[PDB]
Amino acid sequence: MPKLILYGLEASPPVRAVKLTLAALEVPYEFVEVNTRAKENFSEEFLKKNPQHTVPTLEDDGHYIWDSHAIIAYLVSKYGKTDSLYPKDLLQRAVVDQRLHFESGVIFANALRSITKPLFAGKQTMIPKERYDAIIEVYDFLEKFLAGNDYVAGNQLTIADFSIISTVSSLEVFVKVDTTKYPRIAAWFKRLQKLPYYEEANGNGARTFESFIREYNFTFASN
Amino acid sequence: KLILYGLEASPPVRAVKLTLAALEVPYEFVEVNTRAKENFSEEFLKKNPQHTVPTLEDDGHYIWDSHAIIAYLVSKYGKTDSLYPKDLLQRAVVDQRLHFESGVIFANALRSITKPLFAGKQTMIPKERYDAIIEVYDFLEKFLAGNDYVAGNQLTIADFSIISTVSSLEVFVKVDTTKYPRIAAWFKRLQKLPYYEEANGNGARTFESFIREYNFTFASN
């Protein structure tokens, strides 16, 4: 079994979701930079590996898997000593899968990429109010989801925590999480920050992402 | 036994109807009409704090998000794993296609239009929203490649998820069957399933009826 290869850049939230998972699993891997900002994801070689041309993409012994959620489920299912990070119990898995799918649509597509795509596409319109509202909606739901539990999908750390923190840590550049309004999110962030691998796997790239975004002079419209 | 909460007009509800029909698992259907905001009753909020349909009750447990539901259904009730293979590499393709539907399709292409439309906001839809639909078709055509189904040569829950929204995106932008022959052939293949019209077709028609209440056009760039 050759060692795994992760394609992407640290700045990318879904890449960091995979970095978190690989660290938690203590699985060695090679990281190969694919700079989406310089369109390296459109290389013909990369398209062969992933016709959607997204990062992260993962190689495992000549097979290419993409979508961070598909990847991190695969990684735990394949390499986890136990299923702790992605329980096989069907009800527990259904909560984790719901949280992962929530992250795919409501968080990444609707709240994050909806801003970053027009921003990187040179638009200076002033970000519409609906996009501000979409981020607050994420925080409001996450605060509810965390009720009565230390982690986002129950009482144990799972890949849903990794997926959701990857994007929440980056949404903060646009709208900081108010720690008074959202004490559960704040506490959950602090809990994940204590993981020994958190800063290497997510924090550093979150900071790089923030630096990239602060190059632009964005504003939100009041209406 | 099982209770499905929703309205068949809703694409993700149809993905679940398709799955339940394929599995031949009986269920009770309870109408929760989100267009009429029935999803904000105290009773429904207790069952699902995200107030989305579909929501499933199975043995007193509430599960939501169509993709979590349909995976759960096959894993629990499937006589074989055909619809959601346990093989980890085949599962990774299906999970990718499911997550593709959650984000690139439902969130970015469909709900991005229907939310403001149904709220009475915009009649003139930004061109980026047209582009988002074309991008789905381009990717889906590529994904289908030479295979009969979206994740390979066997029917899976990914087909049910993706057809549920693609059948409704056509209201805004028809699939050009000359340009997208694989999508066209895949649509026909699914339409042949004996439960297709009950599980997806009827709701797609109702949803189309909702959309055509509005006088929508697309803006230029």
Side-chain angles (χ1 to χ4, degrees), chain A residues 2-36 38-122 125-223, chain B residues 2-45 47-120 122-173 175-221:
Chain A
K3 83 193 287 196
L4 299 176
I5 307 165
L6 179 55
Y7 300 106
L9 57 177
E10 271 211 310
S12 166
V15 175
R16 287 181 264 122
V18 180
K19 291 189 79 197
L20 282 164
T21 302
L22 289 158
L25 292 170
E26 305 177 349
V27 165
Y29 65 102
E30 296 287 345
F31 190 82
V32 172
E33 175 184 330
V34 176
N35 184 4
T36 56
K39 324 302 181 302
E40 296 187 347
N41 53 315
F42 289 88
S43 175
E44 286 177 359
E45 282 305 303
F46 196 75
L47 267 16
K48 289 174 187 185
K49 298 174 177 174
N50 179 2
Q52 207 184 327
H53 53 83
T54 58
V55 300
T57 297
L58 185 101
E59 185 176 346
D60 186 352
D61 195 22
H63 302 277
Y64 301 99
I65 303 170
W66 75 94
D67 192 295
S68 66
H69 313 85
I71 292 167
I72 69 193
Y74 169 90
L75 288 171
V76 177
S77 294
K78 185 164 264 268
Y79 299 113
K81 280 156 172 178
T82 74
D83 67 350
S84 189
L85 293 163
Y86 189 45
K88 298 185 288 196
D89 178 81
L90 299 183
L91 283 174
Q92 288 176 44
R93 185 165 287 200
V95 183
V96 175
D97 283 346
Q98 178 272 313
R99 300 297 203 247
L100 293 169
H101 282 282
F102 181 81
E103 197 284 338
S104 286
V106 172
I107 311 186
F108 184 87
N110 194 62
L112 195 242
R113 182 163 165 145
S114 58
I115 298 177
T116 62
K117 186 168 177 173
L119 194 66
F120 303 156
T125 304
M126 194 177 292
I127 303 167
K129 176 58 162 205
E130 284 91 347
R131 300 270 66 73
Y132 172 84
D133 293 346
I135 295 172
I136 299 306
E137 281 165 6
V138 171
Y139 301 163
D140 285 343
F141 283 137
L142 292 176
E143 185 77 7
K144 292 183 205 306
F145 290 172
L146 289 163
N149 292 310
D150 290 333
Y151 300 92
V152 80
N155 61 32
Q156 264 181 344
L157 182 67
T158 67
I159 54 169
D161 298 284
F162 299 155
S163 178
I164 294 173
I165 196 66
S166 73
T167 34
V168 168
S169 65
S170 286
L171 286 176
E172 285 210 281
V173 185
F174 297 109
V175 184
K176 173 172 78 168
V177 170
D178 188 294
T179 61
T180 294
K181 181 172 184 201
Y182 300 113
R184 299 168 184 74
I185 295 174
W188 166 77
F189 212 124
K190 286 187 168 93
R191 183 172 301 112
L192 299 183
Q193 284 178 316
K194 293 177 197 170
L195 295 163
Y197 52 82
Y198 173 85
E199 295 290 350
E200 188 198 311
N202 190 64
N204 285 334
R207 285 178 288 274
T208 299
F209 181 89
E210 176 172 25
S211 76
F212 289 176
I213 292 293
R214 294 203 197 290
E215 297 161 346
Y216 300 83
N217 296 300
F218 66 91
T219 314
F220 282 104
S222 297
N223 278 312
Chain B
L2 299 169
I3 308 176
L4 176 62
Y5 297 88
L7 231 59
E8 70 173 1
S10 305
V13 174
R14 290 182 263 126
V16 182
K17 288 180 67 64
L18 283 161
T19 299
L20 287 160
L23 292 165
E24 302 178 349
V25 174
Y27 64 101
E28 293 280 350
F29 186 89
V30 169
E31 266 109 326
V32 176
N33 181 351
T34 58
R35 208 181 158 211
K37 288 185 164 59
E38 296 178 351
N39 52 317
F40 291 94
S41 73
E42 101 178 285
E43 289 101 339
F44 195 72
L45 260 7
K47 298 174 204 205
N48 177 3
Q50 205 184 326
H51 54 76
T52 58
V53 303
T55 295
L56 182 84
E57 175 183 346
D58 187 354
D59 195 27
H61 300 99
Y62 307 107
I63 304 170
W64 73 94
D65 193 293
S66 67
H67 314 86
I69 292 167
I70 63 188
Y72 169 87
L73 290 169
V74 177
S75 297
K76 187 164 175 184
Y77 298 107
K79 279 159 171 138
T80 70
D81 70 350
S82 196
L83 290 168
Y84 191 43
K86 300 174 170 286
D87 177 274
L88 294 182
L89 285 172
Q90 294 165 217
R91 181 158 295 195
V93 184
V94 177
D95 283 341
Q96 180 271 317
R97 299 292 201 257
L98 292 167
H99 280 283
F100 180 83
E101 201 283 340
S102 291
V104 174
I105 309 188
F106 184 87
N108 194 60
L110 185 63
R111 187 61 165 154
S112 56
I113 297 173
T114 61
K115 191 183 178 201
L117 188 72
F118 290 168
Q122 67 182 30
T123 187
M124 194 135 155
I125 304 158
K127 184 63 193 301
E128 286 87 1
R129 299 275 60 78
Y130 188 101
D131 291 353
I133 296 173
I134 296 297
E135 292 170 1
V136 171
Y137 300 164
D138 289 330
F139 282 140
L140 181 57
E141 185 77 6
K142 190 71 186 190
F143 293 167
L144 280 164
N147 299 145
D148 282 354
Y149 302 101
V150 296
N153 261 319
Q154 289 289 256
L155 184 65
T156 70
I157 52 173
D159 295 283
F160 298 155
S161 182
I162 296 172
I163 192 61
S164 75
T165 33
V166 169
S167 63
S168 291
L169 292 177
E170 285 213 278
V171 181
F172 297 109
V173 185
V175 174
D176 178 340
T177 60
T178 297
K179 178 166 181 59
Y180 300 110
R182 299 163 187 88
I183 294 172
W186 166 77
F187 213 134
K188 288 178 28 173
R189 193 171 294 125
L190 299 179
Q191 282 178 307
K192 294 179 160 65
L193 294 165
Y195 50 83
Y196 175 81
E197 294 290 350
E198 195 324 82
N200 190 67
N202 279 343
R205 285 178 288 276
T206 301
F207 202 68
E208 173 177 32
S209 82
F210 296 167
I211 293 170
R212 273 160 200 187
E213 289 173 35
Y214 300 87
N215 280 116
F216 66 86
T217 59
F218 285 95
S220 76
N221 291 310

